[PDB]
Design a protein around this nucleic acid. Structure first.
Lengths: 97, 107, 93, 77, 121, 199, 74, 96, 84, 106, 92
DNA sequence: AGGATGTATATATCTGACACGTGCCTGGAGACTAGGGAGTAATCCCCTTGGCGGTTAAAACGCGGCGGACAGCGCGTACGTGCGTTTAAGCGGTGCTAGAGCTGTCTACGACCAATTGAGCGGCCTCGGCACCGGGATTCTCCAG
DNA sequence: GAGAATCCCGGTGCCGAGGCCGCTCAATTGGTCGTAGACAGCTCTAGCACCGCTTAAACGCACGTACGCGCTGTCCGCCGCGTTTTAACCGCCAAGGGGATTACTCCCTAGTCTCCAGGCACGTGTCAGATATATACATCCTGT
């Protein structure tokens, strides 16, 4: 057997995923989530395809930005992990209550 | 009647001048539009488009390809210092993120 | 006839600034929305600048001030110049 | 209950694209909450725009306008 | 050395309005004659610009620089021409005012005069 | 109102300079402030550190460690103008002590590319301390904003081609209109000799 | 001193003059190579029309600059 | 020789300044600052009396709003004081 | 026909003023290096506002910055002001 | 006689002035007849709400007027008006009082 | 001859709170408030009438504009008040 | 410092997306006329810059001592890495009604012009609510037991 | 249990809110005219519900190694208070640039026929880029 020590494969993942462009979250569960949320404001709604694609793109952008801000906040306090307090602080400075 | 010479040719432009006129008159921006505003608008728009498409092709020829896909426009936009503050609230589709790893995570 | 686009006019500028490159299909959509955004912003600013001073038209000076307001740094001092050139080639014909 | 379709590895991949290196164990629930709120707002505005014009199909321009009303322009469509 | 809100010291206010005994006292008491303001002017500059000859004489007689520059790199001769005077030009030229220095716009002092005798030199 | 600053002294030498200043009872400085009107350089040749270059550009003395030894021995106030590093960082003081313009008074610069041997912020600070200005886009030699500039550049030679053409592209045909192209070596040499050497 | 002139069709013509001439002479030199008569040409430089009767150096033109040429027919 | 202990006068000043409405930036220096920058942009300007007051109000509200989030970031790291690193994290997360 | 100028005036916004602003913010203990940072931020903000104000003024062929111009500038940036 | 338009709709805010401002402000080619009779009511309701909540806090401090401090106190305590006016600065107002829970004495 | 809604605010205040008054530095705030809300609502209604290839700015546009801009609870009260006013007006 | 896993090069081949071509229908161009918005001169008077001076509230300089920030070392549990097992995403088919677009008539609603009259704006003017000032009361903190 | 600081209670003075008057300019009534928006009606692009399968990705368990979090010392940086030196704030007088209105004459733009070239939907074809392959070589660890 031969192992890498902790903290090495993570850097490889960082380098890989920051160079591609494919979509990350799967495609069918997102469709079902959107339909189940929107099924409380009307009754017989129908969706095109560009609609779910656009929603997915915007959601991914939002979450990636949030995680960048959280990481900066975490490093600011002499740590390397991230925890819920960081998400709360980032979102409260931004102005989203 | 003499031979027709279009308005986009007298100014030495490539964007249209009839279309900009028509869209400025039937969009309810004012009650009457002068006869010199469309040329100004066309010139400015053409300059911006040229400025972005010149910077896209450099990053295109870097990675040894002969087309322009959205990743290249994202790179060219996010890597300049003035074209960033103008488009600082837009998100390109099928784009990506710039490479940056913090310096207190390396071995 | 049907919906009109700005796609026959980006290709010409491309062939003029870079003579050995093409452009894909989705990139054309990006470049086709980028023009509408800027158009609407500039027109909307010129309208209000005409409404404050009690005037009733849109002339070249309104566009000049609208451009100088909402373009940052050294992108103004260039664009303005270009614009002026066009008008001077127009009145002299 | 369909919020469980956003699994654990998906959140890990988004985090990696962010730039993080070590994730904790109680970070997933908060992510799901934030996502739910965002989607709720956008979808409600879109359905209002759609119901106005007497239609029954949410199209792409509706979502584009809904995102534009908050500062998320989203060129591309 | 309590300066004003514009940069002017006491010698500046003394020079901008001819008060020769006051300047004599101020100089004999001790005051450096080469101190620029926030724009870049010097006492000799204003002295030659407004048109008092005796103050320029007194300032020159105490080792003040003769080709110092200021706003947009204008020499004393530049103002002495651009306004129009007779005596100060003769005095300065006798003292060694450079007649070939140039300003930021690329012009010479001869290009800023109207009089025939003025253009003669 | 003498001040002090160091540009390569030793730790024991640093303590020695501290004690000498205390004997002189003057304010010291670690970060480069504006009023730093004295610089002590270890060796006997103008080095290529950022601090020494900023010192020669702002204008002040560049003295050697022999003056430190002499001040330690004689224990008196000072004796200047005997150990100044000569031949090139001397015309700067003579230019600043006669009310003349700065070096790059009327030039425009643009940086572009990848800089490895030297960083970027350092060069930007050097330019903005010299007297010029920095640009943000590439100066194409066919646009109106480049042709409509009338600013002769002082400090050039008597009658040459570096008097009407005052824009530069710097990286890490040589004159197309009013725009040049030059490597970083020419810049960093131009600073440490106080003269716009041609081409 | 060489000088470039540019025409709306996208061409470049080169000329050689001295810095004490008059616009009429430049128009004559242009007609000596183009063919258009010297009564229908108008020149543009730095966003302003040029009149006939002044010297070149008055408008601050130096070596290796560019002028634009426009006709008056249509 | 009576003497308070460090920490009590600050709370009192907090309670006092949070219950009063008045400008606290010494008008005439502020006027000179605005005129200096204006001199930078154009030549030979002159200001009304209301422009300076409007600018004063806006530029005080901005700084108060910044200092609140600075204090939050500082508390987040098990400290009581504010240093010149918190301001930068605040301005970075905000988007300026 | 000369011209005078003003310089080095950011030092009138002294130390106790920054302290009073911080008190109204909610802080309790202040370090000894926040002052330069505060001054820098203030200068940047004021420049960005006065530029647009002067542009509006110069459009209408006037020479005095009025009260409505600052309001229009601040609404352009993103922060409105009620009262004038 | 002449029954005015704002008094046959039950309102107190005007109805003709709004018509003129909608017709000569470049918002569309034509403005319908039932367009202002809605805007007037909406504006009136919002103003009544704000003014009532301001007068309350004005009374709770032993005074009989309304100065800007009271409007500032009545806006930042509503949890539904704080969202509509979030990027607004009231002149000559102030800030709400709250000290954090850590900096208090033991 | 300038214009200002400085007389109607008085009537609403006199009918909600009988014995009170308004200082002069507090009427300008109400003026600016009314103007800003007017501009927001009318602008959104205009954009919504243009995104459908139509030319009249009718009442449904204002309904949808109110339902988009104002937050949750205030919307229901606002819509009810407007509807009551309009139906009373058209009844007579 | 070999041994073992990734990542980069180099070369086959192969399918589907880009660049060019040709009828032809709707929107841009040349030539003319009728009316009102904006460019240009004069002239009245409100309000911004520049000085002078006495008085007292804030800014600048210094000192002795305590609470907090930054660097050490010592435990114990929560998260990173490689495996073998079980769930359901993605691809490619085919049948199908519901709802988005287009077209052709025909009528109820808003721009437009004229004549007559009450609501809302500018200025005067006088009494009550708030700002400013001295005096006992009561709450809150620190050294000492 | 004492010191300093904050809250009530009268008490005099002073200017800005709350009414009031003529009159001028926009809102109301009473008409006609040319054209958007409601409402039937027929054609056909695209979205929802199914089925089988091949294989990439989500679940579940084990072991051991950094990293989070709670202690205990050492000492330089910042708060609180009293004396001295600087320039803001207030009230007052004088001179001249530029913001607000008012008129008169002319040049620039909306509104209408007419005819000729620039741009859109539809076809058909050849080359740049995505995939499978062997392997050449550039980091990462554990042993000594």
């Amino acid at each position: 057997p031969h192992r890498y020590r902790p903290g090495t494969v993570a850097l490889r993942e960082i380098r890989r995923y920051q160079k591609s462009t494919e979509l990350l979250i799967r495609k069918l569960p997102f469709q079902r989530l959107v339909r189940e949320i929107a099924q409380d404001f009307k009754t017989d709604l129908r969706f095109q395809s560009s609609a779910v694609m656009a929603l997915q793109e915007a959601c991914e952008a939002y979450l990636v930005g949030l995680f960048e801000d959280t990481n900066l906040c975490a490093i600011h306090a002499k740590r390397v992990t991230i925890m819920p307090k960081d998400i709360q602080l980032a979102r409260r400075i931004r102005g989203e209550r | 009647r003499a031979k027709a010479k279009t308005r986009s040719s007298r100014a030495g432009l490539q964007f249209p001048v009839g279309r900009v006129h028509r869209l400025l008159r039937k969009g309810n921006y004012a009650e009457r539009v002068g006869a010199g505003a469309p040329v100004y608008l066309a010139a400015v728009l053409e300059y911006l488009t040229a400025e972005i498409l010149e910077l896209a092709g450099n990053a295109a020829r870097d990675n040894k390809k002969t087309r322009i896909i959205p990743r290249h426009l994202q790179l060219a936009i996010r890597n300049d210092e003035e074209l960033n503050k103008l488009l600082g609230k837009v998100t390109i589709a099928q784009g990506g993120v710039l490479p940056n790893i913090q310096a207190v995570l390396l071995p | 006839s049907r919906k009109e686009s700005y796609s026959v006019y980006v290709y010409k500028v491309l062939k003029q600034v870079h003579p050995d490159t093409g452009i894909s299909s989705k990139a054309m959509g990006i470049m086709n929305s980028f023009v509408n955004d800027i158009f609407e912003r500039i027109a909307g600013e010129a309208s209000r600048l005409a409404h404050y001073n009690k005037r009733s038209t849109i002339t070249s000076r309104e566009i000049q001030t609208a451009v100088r307001l909402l373009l940052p740094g050294e992108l103004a001092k260039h664009a303005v110049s270009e614009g002026t050139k066009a008008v001077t080639k127009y009145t002299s014909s | 209950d369909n919020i469980q379709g956003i699994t654990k590895p998906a959140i890990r991949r988004l985090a990696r694209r962010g730039g993080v290196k070590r994730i904790s164990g109680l970070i997933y629930e908060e992510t799901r909450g934030v996502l739910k709120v965002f989607l709720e707002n956008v979808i409600r505005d879109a359905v209002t725009y759609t119901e106005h014009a007497k239609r029954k199909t949410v199209t792409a321009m509706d979502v584009v306008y809904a995102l534009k009303r908050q500062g998320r322009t989203l060129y591309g469509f | 050395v309590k300066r004003n809100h514009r940069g002017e010291t006491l010698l500046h206010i003394a020079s901008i309005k001819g008060d020769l005994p006051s300047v004599e006292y101020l100089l004999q008491n001790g005051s450096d004659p080469n101190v620029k303001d926030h724009a870049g002017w010097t006492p000799l500059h204003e002295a030659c610009n407004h048109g008092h000859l005796k103050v320029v004489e007194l300032l020159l007689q105490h080792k003040a620089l003769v080709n110092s520059t200021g706003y947009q790199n204008d020499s004393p001769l530049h103002d002495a021409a651009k306004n129009g005077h007779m005596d100060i030009v003769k005095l300065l030229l006798s003292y060694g005012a450079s007649r070939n220095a140039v300003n930021i716009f690329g012009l010479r002092p001869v290009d800023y005069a109207d009089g025939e005798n003025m253009k003669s030199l | 109102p003498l001040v002090l600053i160091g540009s390569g002294l030793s730790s024991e030498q640093q303590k020695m300079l501290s004690e000498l200043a205390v004997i002189l009872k003057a304010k010291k400085c670690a970060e480069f402030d504006s009023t730093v009107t004295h610089v002590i350089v270890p060796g006997d040749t103008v080095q290529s550190t950022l601090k020494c270059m900023l010192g020669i550009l702002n204008g002040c003395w560049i003295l050697k460690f022999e003056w430190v030894k002499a001040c330690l021995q004689r224990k008196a106030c000072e004796q200047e103008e005997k150990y100044e590093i000569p031949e090139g960082p001397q015309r700067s003081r003579l230019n600043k002590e006669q009310l003349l313009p700065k070096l790059f008074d009327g030039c425009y610069f643009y940086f572009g590319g990848a800089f490895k041997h030297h960083p970027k912020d350092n060069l930007v600070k050097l330019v903005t301390a010299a007297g010029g200005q920095v640009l943000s886009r590439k100066p194409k030699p066919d646009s109106d904003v480049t042709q409509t500039i009338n600013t002769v550049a002082y400090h050039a030679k008597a009658d040459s081609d570096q008097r009407f053409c005052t824009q530069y592209i710097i990286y890490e045909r040589v004159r197309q209109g009013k725009v040049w192209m030059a490597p970083s070596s020419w810049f960093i040499d131009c600073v440490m000799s106080f003269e716009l050497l041609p081409l | 001193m060489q000088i470039f002139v540019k025409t709306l069709t996208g061409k470049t013509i080169t000329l050689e003059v001295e810095p004490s001439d008059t616009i009429e002479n430049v128009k004559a030199k242009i007609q000596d190579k183009e063919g258009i008569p010297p009564d229908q040409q108008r020149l543009i430089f730095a966003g302003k029309q040029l009149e006939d009767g002044r010297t070149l150096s008055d408008y601050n033109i130096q070596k290796e600059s560019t002028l634009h040429l426009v006709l008056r027919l249509r």
